[PDB]
Predict the 3D structure of the following.
Amino acid sequence: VTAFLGERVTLTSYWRRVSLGPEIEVSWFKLGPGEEQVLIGRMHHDVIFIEWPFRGFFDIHRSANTFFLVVTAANISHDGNYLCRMKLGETEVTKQEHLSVVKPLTLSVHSERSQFPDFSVLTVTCTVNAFPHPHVQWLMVMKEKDGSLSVAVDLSLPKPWHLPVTCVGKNDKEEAHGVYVSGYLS
Amino acid sequence: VTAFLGERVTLTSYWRRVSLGPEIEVSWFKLGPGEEQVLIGRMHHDVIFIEWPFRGFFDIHRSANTFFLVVTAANISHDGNYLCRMKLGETEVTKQEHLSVVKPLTLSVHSERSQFPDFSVLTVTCTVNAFPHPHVQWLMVMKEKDGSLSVAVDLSLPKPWHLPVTCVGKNDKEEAHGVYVSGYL
Amino acid sequence: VTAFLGERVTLTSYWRRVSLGPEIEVSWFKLGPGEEQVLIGRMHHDVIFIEWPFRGFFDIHRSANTFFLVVTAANISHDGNYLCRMKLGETEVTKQEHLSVVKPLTLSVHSERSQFPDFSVLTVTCTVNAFPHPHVQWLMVMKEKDGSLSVAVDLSLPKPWHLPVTCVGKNDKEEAHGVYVSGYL
Amino acid sequence: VTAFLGERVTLTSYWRRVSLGPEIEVSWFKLGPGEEQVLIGRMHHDVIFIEWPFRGFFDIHRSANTFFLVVTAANISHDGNYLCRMKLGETEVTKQEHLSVVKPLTLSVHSERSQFPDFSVLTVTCTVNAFPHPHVQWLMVMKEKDGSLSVAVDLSLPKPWHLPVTCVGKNDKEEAHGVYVSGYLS
Amino acid sequence: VTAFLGERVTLTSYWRRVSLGPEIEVSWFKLGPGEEQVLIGRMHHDVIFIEWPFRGFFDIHRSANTFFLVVTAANISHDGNYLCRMKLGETEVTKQEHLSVVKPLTLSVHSERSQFPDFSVLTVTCTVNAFPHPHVQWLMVMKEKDGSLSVAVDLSLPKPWHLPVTCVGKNDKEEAHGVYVSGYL
Amino acid sequence: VTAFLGERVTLTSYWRRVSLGPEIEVSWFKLGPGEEQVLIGRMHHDVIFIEWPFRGFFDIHRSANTFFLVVTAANISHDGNYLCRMKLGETEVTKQEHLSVVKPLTLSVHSERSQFPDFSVLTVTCTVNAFPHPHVQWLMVMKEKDGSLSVAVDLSLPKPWHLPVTCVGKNDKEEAHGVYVSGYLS
Amino acid sequence: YCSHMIGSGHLQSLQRLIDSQMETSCQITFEFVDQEQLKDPVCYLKKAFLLVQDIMEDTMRFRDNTPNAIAIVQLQELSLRLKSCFTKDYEEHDKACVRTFYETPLQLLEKVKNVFNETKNLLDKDWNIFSKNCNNSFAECS
Amino acid sequence: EYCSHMIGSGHLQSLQRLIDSQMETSCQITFEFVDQEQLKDPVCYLKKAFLLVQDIMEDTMRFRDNTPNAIAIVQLQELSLRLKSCFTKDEEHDKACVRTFYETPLQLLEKVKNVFNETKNLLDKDWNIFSKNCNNSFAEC
Amino acid sequence: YCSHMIGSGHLQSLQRLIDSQMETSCQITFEFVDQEQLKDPVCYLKKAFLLVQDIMEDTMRFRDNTPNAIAIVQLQELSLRLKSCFTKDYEEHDKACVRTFYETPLQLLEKVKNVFNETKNLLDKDWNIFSKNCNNSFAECS
Amino acid sequence: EYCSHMIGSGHLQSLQRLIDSQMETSCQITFEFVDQEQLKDPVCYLKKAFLLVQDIMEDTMRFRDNTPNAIAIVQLQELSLRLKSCFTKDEEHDKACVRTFYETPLQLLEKVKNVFNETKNLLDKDWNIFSKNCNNSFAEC
Amino acid sequence: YCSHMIGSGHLQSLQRLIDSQMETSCQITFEFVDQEQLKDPVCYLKKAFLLVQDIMEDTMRFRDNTPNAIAIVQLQELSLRLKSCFTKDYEEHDKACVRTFYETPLQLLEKVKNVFNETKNLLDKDWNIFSKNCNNSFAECS
Amino acid sequence: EYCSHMIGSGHLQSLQRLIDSQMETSCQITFEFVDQEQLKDPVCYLKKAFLLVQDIMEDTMRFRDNTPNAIAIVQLQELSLRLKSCFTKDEEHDKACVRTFYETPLQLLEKVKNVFNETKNLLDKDWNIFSKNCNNSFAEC
Ligand SMILES: *[C@@H]1O[C@H](CO)[C@@H](O[C@@H]2O[C@H](CO)[C@@H](O[C@@H]3O[C@H](CO)[C@@H](O)[C@H](O)[C@@H]3O)[C@H](O)[C@H]2NC(C)=O)[C@H](O)[C@H]1NC(C)=O
Ligand SMILES: *[C@@H]1O[C@H](CO)[C@@H](O[C@@H]2O[C@H](CO)[C@@H](O[C@@H]3O[C@H](CO)[C@@H](O)[C@H](O)[C@@H]3O)[C@H](O)[C@H]2NC(C)=O)[C@H](O)[C@H]1NC(C)=O
């Protein structure tokens, strides 16, 4: 599924035979790099136990034959693939889900004028912070602590400044513009 | 005069008669509210001394009948009125100048979708941090550490989301636009 | 219900009629003293939103006419009364549950010999840190950061030291003993 | 001698000929590893001087022919052998003392129940902190900042819990017991 | 008695009759202002116990009818009056001693030339940090962390600078001189 | 020139032809080690710009044909040689100046008596902190954070103390004395 | 005359409800008599029965005019009569000796059937049985 | 020709008898079924829906053996076993066009009833209807 | 009669002052009419002229009894007469439409000459020109 | 003999006419000149001062071409060109004994006038005066 | 008549006490006249002597009925007489010109002997010697 | 036989004369002696105690030469020199069974007096008493 930053999100799985729910030994995993499988939590007969690392970030609960892996609050780290393995006796069944996390882009524009040799060259700056794919462009990459990605671009305008000038920022299909119209002084 | 943040700036005062420069006892002040005086520095016969509080932030130098007050690098604190006291014997003349410091506005746009009762209400946010007069409004005040003023505004869009939407931010005459065109989903 | 420290726990509420589950506007609260209400989270038509203060500590999920409040990992703070407000149109029903959190008691024994006026008086110490009701007594209150309660008791033995001596500690029904058998010298 | 943690303790030495006291050049030492001799302090004609390292921790004073090395407050570091060297002119005499420091043991018991797959397996823990020789045992090693030694042991009890259960802790001849009698719930 | 900073020091008290030493219940106090009593330590039958606050700073030991209070290393705090209470049965005798701690004075000289209105006035500075009574004066109070007292004095010399100039610093009877002979320029 | 610590000081340069001032492209430099040239600031047509490193520590201004490099407040680091390069068109002229920084010396004297074997040996100490050349001497090197130089000397006096005793401190041509006259006790 | 107030045909319909419901993991919350707290065989049933009737309205529900929906209305009609074979005790004890269960609907029906079956059985022996003032036996519950 | 007369009116009735019988609750369950939005053509929708219904009944609809409803299911599976011949098969698109529904059992039975009823009505109209190979329609999913 | 109040000999002396001053980078601060704020050609001059006279005393100075010092006193004498060819306007506006310049002395003199030259020119056309109440045109300045 | 009659009284006058003409201001400028304190001998002071004055006028004293003052400068440079013969030269000490003065133009012209006037008076007294080689005096600097 | 108040036999016994005590490092605290503060030879002794008597009771002690214990009682008896050969001065000065010493018992006895020996010597010369009002000489001490 | 008549009554008296003479004080000193608790047998206790007393007097009891007490000590050492023959020796257990006492000189003299007095009385009873070799008793220490 797709979910935004900080939002609650749920991945689901279930047992074919509707007669059985608690009898199923459910266990969710977190697919790290290299097909690594990090055990998030387990459930069986309504006795749930989350591994301490994920504790508070993930929870499991059931309703009939359906099993839910609830993300209390999503962060960029959580973007990836998850795995639910259900077992009744010796037979097992598996379901795979891809949770794509998104951080709505933040397009910021600002300028500052040259201090030498004169005060004629104005340089506007367009900076766009988003996830997973930020992109900035004038019409004529750093990692954040959040796990997001910031990227920025500069434009130099000799006087006469040919304002207005537009920069286009976007996160895949998401998009926004920033237009510097006029300076403070003239 | 007017100057931007970080830039070098100079206020000037002068003696009426062009005959005298060094003889004048120049002294500059920083006018707090109530037109209260805080001594920045003094000059006389080309011997200058800046008070240690303002040392490195302000300097004084002379050319003929003119007297310069140099702001090495201006910050928001400096915005205000300055007063020069020029004394020669029993006569004293005062000249007043106004330094307006400006921080180029920074317009930012960012959105979020409601998490309750549903995911249908998109609230886009327009934030403008400038000085001295930031302003934001949608087309349809917090104080920072640097001394500037941040202000923001939210616009709620029920489904279907009528996009594009434009927000107009500006700092007095300075101005810029922000347009949210489309969501990610 | 009753649950130990760190464990996962669930309080439940439900709608009287089994016909309706999603339609009910569920909302859970944390009852401070004076039966004051602090909003934990809400649920409606399976759209859940927990307030940021309780985010990660509490969750809400539904099954049929039942409504669960999940405590991810319980701490002493959580001990108290909880209240569920279920609203359907003009009618509203309230159900109240009590979560008793428990910290397994930790009984410790330790001794010291008097340093004045002589080294003849042995004072053995029995310390029991538990919750909610630690208790210590010899056979013949301080608050911690985790929110638990430590209590201790001293027993003085003049020479000759009559050993063994037993101290009985307990947390309500939970119980353990500590016995000092002999000194080092 | 033997002294407990934090207590004041005194090692002594003296000069055979009772006529002389101040005339004797007294000097106490601290036997480090490898027969190392760390000068603690000196005394002669009632002029005492403690090396700055030991300053406040050790003091020297005299009464007639007897010389005293006073430990203001003992710590685990002080456990070891000391040396008093007395000299009159060219002839010297030496006395050796062993100060054994002791930290009364602290026996602590506590339990916690399994959180998965059920809540049936109760694990009691017996921890004993003492010096110099802590030892823990159920009836069916870490170093502290004090310089003491902590050691602990666990016991797993499947339901039915065969309580009561006893653990025996002791510091050489010192000894104490810890018995878990009943749980909070049943 | 009198002793310098950091040095070892001993105050003494004694019993009138030479027959008795151990039998006497000795106890030393530190007299704060108002002759208020703060217990340092006790001794009886050669069993000593110092209160934990003074532990390591003070010790008590006996020789015959004499009773010693040993200051391991003296600091300014220790300067003041001390009181020994010796009790035998129903009789009690008190003996009082005064410990004067001294910090050797540190005389320092340093100069600066005026920066306004000209560079013609040389101001030499004489600083003396001692205890208990620092004193400075030119020949023509601040408290430190260690507990000592710093004091200084300035001497202004218009051009031409009449050098040498001598400043006399002293701590009661202790004394030292500082002489500025010539400038760098 | 010569200037003391913390004082305001000015190095100057000028253009031969008195007709021209603003037209000249002035630029001051800081001669680091190895004939290195660190650009302090520039000026042309009364548009001044100081490199951010030196910002606040140095400033440039003009009066007619003369150009000034003002040191707001001098520190020991500033001691060295500076360079002013003036250019009109393709022709250039250079001027060189040596700013010698000085920290007025601070002569301090103090004593402490032996604590063993007796209290008879008094050791007076003479310490002189100055710049650039501190020097201490009794009549019978460490670097500070300021960039200054501290140096000190000790003198041991067996009783009878032959007081008074004098120590001579000096910074090149600057000079001062410290005399210990009498002890506190006798 | 209360011994044959509960017809055999009633248990027949209830068995059908059970054997006509779908088997699943589904589970719900419903009120019911706390068996452990109230152990007296007679008062337990008297209370269990009265409780089932309030529960039945909103718990056991079917589409209007279906065979099962009719079965339910018949069970309610049956109670309106039985209202006489029981004596009022006290109002404090309503919601006393009662607890809550989170279990499958089939397990509920099994409880309801069991309650009707045993109730009928006891009535056959003595029709005066449920005139007992159980107030005292209700008091122990908490 | 023979397909028209297979799905008896009696079969639809029994399905309704199961539905009318079910007890109403908030209970919801997860089951596999054809995504109506993903594949919108009505004729092909019934075609695929059917193949799922056969695997569905085994795991989804369960009753105590020999009850009127348990027997009712057996009559439907038998009916389905012979019916497979009246349908042309296009198996690669299995696991495609299937979506999971979290819905009440009644909503399920209503979906199954809807399928059988729509089927019967459509078959009556045309016995030759199901010659189409909607492999292309499956690709749309 | 004001048309020939300003003699040609006056501009001659002023030109000499200019062509007799030394060329340097030197620069000073002096008051003068803000040209941008006050654009009206007639009122600009009327104000520019009156301003030059106050400025002249302390701005344009020479050693006493020198050819140039005399030239200055002659220019002042000239004004004492012109005081009649001008009408008083208002006192608020003194120091209105005035700004400050930091420029070389030669550039100042060029401004002064320019002001005298244009002033004389306008007077030649109409001697009644500077009787205008420019109060309204002064008001725009700030 | 011929040196005595070169520096005309008329030349000193014109220099004064330039000085009297200059406008009085606080303005100050930096120019090269002989350090009077560094080299105190009056006879040698004029000797060196002169060599600087020739390079000085070019950069220091400037007037619009053909003005009474611009022409006045030309008369002084020409005068100086021929005068160099009446002076003995000792060039190594160039850049030595020269100091920079930050002073008003009037103070400068006064220094130049002082030099020419002192020169004329001294030459009148002795035409043979400037045979001295003060190389030693320069070393004193 | 005071010249022969102190018998020679008294010093004989004191010498025995000294030559009959054991030599050790042992040291005690006792009061005694500050020799430096009170330097006057006559008043120093007068005060030293009176002081020794108070000191003697609790300082110089022996087993009852021993040769030395008797020697002590004899010295006390001797004083009871001498009480007349001395004149009262003032009470302020008791505990003035007195200090404390921490030294061996033998060193104390040497001081006591020395005090008795010199005292006897001075009395032999003049029996009226210790009638002096030393109040003034006591005042200097501190 | 001859051992019985060595320790004279007169010797015990002189020891008492030293004790009676000593001045009473709080003063305490450290000296070596036999640990009574460590070795409890009375006969062997005197046996070992004696060997220490001989080394003891030299360092412990000191008086100015030729005083009644200094001479008294000499009479005791001489007495001891000849006495060593009346005792059998078992030297390895030297440094064993000896403990340090921090006690007043009077307590010491009382210990020494006690030894000589107990000795005399025991010798009088039996001159052959000290044939025992308590090496075993020393091992008990
Ligand atoms: C903007 O410019 C102003 C000055 O116009 C700055 O304020 C001044 O900041 C300096 C230090 O940055 C202050 O001096 C300091 O004094 C403390 C002791 O109180 C001392 O420890 C420091 O070393 C330093 O000397 C000064 O007092 C302060 N205010 C004034 C009026 O002088 C300000 O920091 C600049 N930046 C901003 C963001 O405002
Ligand atoms: C026991 O559980 C309670 C929650 O039931 C914990 O109390 C909560 O702790 C969190 C952080 O641990 C608090 O939120 C914090 O807010 C601050 C700003 O005020 C922010 O900087 C942090 O990042 C964090 O978001 C929360 O306010 C607090 N209380 C409540 C009622 O929510 C508690 O920490 C747990 N542990 C213990 C030992 O009590």
Q: What stands out?
A: The two ends of chain I are 35 Å apart (CA to CA).
